[model samples]
Target: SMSVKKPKRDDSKDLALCSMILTEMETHEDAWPFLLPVNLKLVPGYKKVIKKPMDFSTIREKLSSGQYPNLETFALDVRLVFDNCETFNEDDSDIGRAGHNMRKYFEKKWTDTFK
Candidate 1:
């Protein structure tokens, strides 16, 4: 006989924050631009490869699968995705500003979740 695995209890707070983050990403027109170019110059093929844009479906999947153990780590992972954007002009690039805003959004969301 195969053993059955028990389902984990859904944390309402986590789910709420997850939904908000997903909605934010979905509505942000500039989010995709921040994710398209492969930025890590130290890695080979960075110029040739384009990364997938993060979206609501991806976040929902990760949340349901328990890929994020805690909210802080999840927020950090979101920030790292933005950190991957290629910055041609750090001070004036639209893409760079979008990445910064995205990171700040996640941080603010994380903080708001606790408040």
Candidate 2:
């Protein structure tokens, strides 16, 4: 049953690009807060509000396991980490501020690379 099952355009190059962006984010000065999952024990009612949790380690695993279909999809996961941070905390807080910095950093990198 081998029908012509054409997938979307191949994105191997884009995957490599995703790796580069991840590296930048992982090494960024404000990387720690978003590097790992938020501690549910430390945060109250986090599960009730955050439908999806995201982080750098998760993103790394997805990229490593070939879970992303394209650069855009990869970008979504990265953005999600920061998005969740902004959603959970005030902009002036430490974690929220790190998310703010990373969002701006990745957006510029994404745009400059492909847009």
Best by lDDT: 2
Q: List the residue pairs that clash in candidate 1.
A: none
| Alpha carbon deviation, residue 108, candidate 1 (Å) | 2.1
**The CA-based lDDT of model 2 is what?**
0.88
lDDT tens digits by residue: candidate 2, 1-115: 3776777565557878888989999999999998888778888989889999999998999999989877778988988988888889899888888889999999999998778
Q: Model 1: C-alpha RMSD to truth?
A: 7.3
lDDT of each: 0.62, 0.88
Q: Ten-residue segment with the worst summed lDDT in candidate 1?
A: 47-56
Q: What is candidate 1's lDDT per residue for 1-115, written digit by digit as tens?
A: 2686678655667756776776776577766654333345765754445354343455667777888787766665566566555423263678678777777776786676665
